[PDB]
């Protein structure tokens, strides 16, 4: 083990901060650990929707949470209920006046933190772990990527002495910082044990 | 009092006397085979191994020697010696033979031209020949009883397993199985020996009260 996170890598070379806001010295840690708890709530109630990215930004007290989903008919709720009651739960545990800012995915099979989550439950529900990859990339590549790679790790439906196997197709120049790529974990949580699905999509060296 | 400290590690073999009170009953249960499963020090890739050892604690043995024979049973015997000697040998009963009746040993001494010297030489050769002879009966029993006790072949030799990669010691004969271990492997032997002793005795009463 040695390969480093491709985000933290280009953290300021391509992909952006999930949190976009300035802070003072004795207040940073305060409106951080509070503000992180938001994605704790958001992931609790949007996996059912496709939570790939959050953009939590702040003014003076005034927050601006902007979410990125699959097909936001989920946050719609009963006409406009979940969009309401979430912003009604957003501010409700801060003290600060929030917002219902929400936006969606253009194409889903082109988002790593998404593409993974599909798989890590696809197999959390037993399914053929090999072909759940070779076709996963194949969906991504028939979704017009430039390259793809998928990784699972741990007891693959059996094998006590657990393994780490993968399949991939296309281009994946990680070491090149120029490349726009995409990475997102996903957690297979099966009866016999727990794995971990990584995913990488090379979208185009901007 | 005896030790073969073979390269690494150990002790290939060690003998030692333990002195004090109740030394017997508080270790008379250790005699037997001791299986051990861990990844040995002698190992070069993560493989567990089932080595073993043979504990053989034998009790104290007080020993004996009365200030020698009963001359009341003893049969002395003078007679003319056999061989070359002429007039002061064909005509002088210089040969001796002595016989210890309740044992059975017979020795004699046509060894020297005396008689008193052959007499005593018989009565001290027959010194050894009775006590130095019986010491075989001692060792024979010692040896044989240690052999049954200690148990020869290994790993299949029962009594107590010491499992390190799980930290669980189990005594087979009475079936404790606590996954404490190591504390005993530090020296705290009792969370173990006390169980067997009660268990040993539990059926002790079920013998002439059953």
């Amino acid at each position: 083990g040695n390969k480093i996170h491709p985000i933290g890598f280009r953290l300021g070379i391509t992909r952006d901060w999930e949190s976009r806001w300035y802070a003072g010295k004795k207040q940073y840690r305060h409106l951080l650990l509070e503000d992180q708890r938001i994605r704790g709530l958001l992931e609790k109630e949007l996996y059912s929707a496709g939570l790939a990215r959050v953009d939590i930004e702040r003014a003076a007290d005034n927050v601006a949470v902007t979410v990125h989903v699959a097909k936001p008919g989920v946050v719609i709720g009963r006409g406009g209920e979940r969009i309401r009651v979430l912003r009604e739960e957003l501010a409700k545990l801060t003290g600060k006046n929030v917002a219902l800012n929400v936006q969606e995915v253009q194409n889903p099979n082109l988002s790593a933190p998404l593409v993974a989550q599909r798989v890590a439950e696809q197999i959390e529900r037993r399914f053929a772990v090999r072909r759940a990859i070779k076709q996963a990339v194949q969906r991504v590549m028939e979704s017009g990527a430039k390259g793809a790679k998928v990784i699972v790790s741990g007891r693959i439906g059996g094998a006590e002495q657990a393994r780490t196997e993968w399949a991939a197709q296309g281009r994946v120049p990680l070491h090149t910082l120029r490349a726009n790529i995409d990475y997102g974990f996903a957690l297979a949580r099966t009866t016999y044990g727990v794995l971990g699905v990584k995913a990488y999509i090379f979208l185009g060296e901007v | 009092m005896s030790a073969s400290e073979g390269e690494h590690g150990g002790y290939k073999e060690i003998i030692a006397k333990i002195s004090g009170d109740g030394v017997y009953g508080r270790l008379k249960f250790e005699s037997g085979g001791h299986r051990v499963q861990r990844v040995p020090a002698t190992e070069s890739q993560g493989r567990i191994h089932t080595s073993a050892c043979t504990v053989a604690v034998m009790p104290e043995l007080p020993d004996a020697e009365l200030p020698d024979i009963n001359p009341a049973d003893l049969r002395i015997d003078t007679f003319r010696s056999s061989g070359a000697g002429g007039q002061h040998v064909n005509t002088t009963d210089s040969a001796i033979r002595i016989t210890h009746l309740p044992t059975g040993i017979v020795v004699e001494c046509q060894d020297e031209r005396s008689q008193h010297k052959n007499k005593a030489k018989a009565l001290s050769v027959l010194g050894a020949r009775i006590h130095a002879a019986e010491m075989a009966k001692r060792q024979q029993a010692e040896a044989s009883t240690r052999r049954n006790l200690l148990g020869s072949g290994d790993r299949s030799d029962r009594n107590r397993t010491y499992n390190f990669p799980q930290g669980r010691v189990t005594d087979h004969r009475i079936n404790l199985t606590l996954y404490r271990l190591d504390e005993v492997m530090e020296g705290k032997l009792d969370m173990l020996i006390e169980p067997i002793i009660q268990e040993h005795q539990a059926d002790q009463l079920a013998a002439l009260s059953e």
Partner: protein
Amino acid sequence: ARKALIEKAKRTPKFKVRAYTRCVRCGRARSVYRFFGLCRICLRELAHKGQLPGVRKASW
């Protein structure tokens, strides 16, 4: 004593010395910053996901 001590590092003390650091996110005690209220890893971890403001990998 797990949870019973992150909850007792936050509770009001018996003195101004039984006061001490606790990683709010993980739960450390040693190597917990004041600047973040964080442990060396939780710091490390979230940082890679850009969820920590302005902090990029150093290089000089």
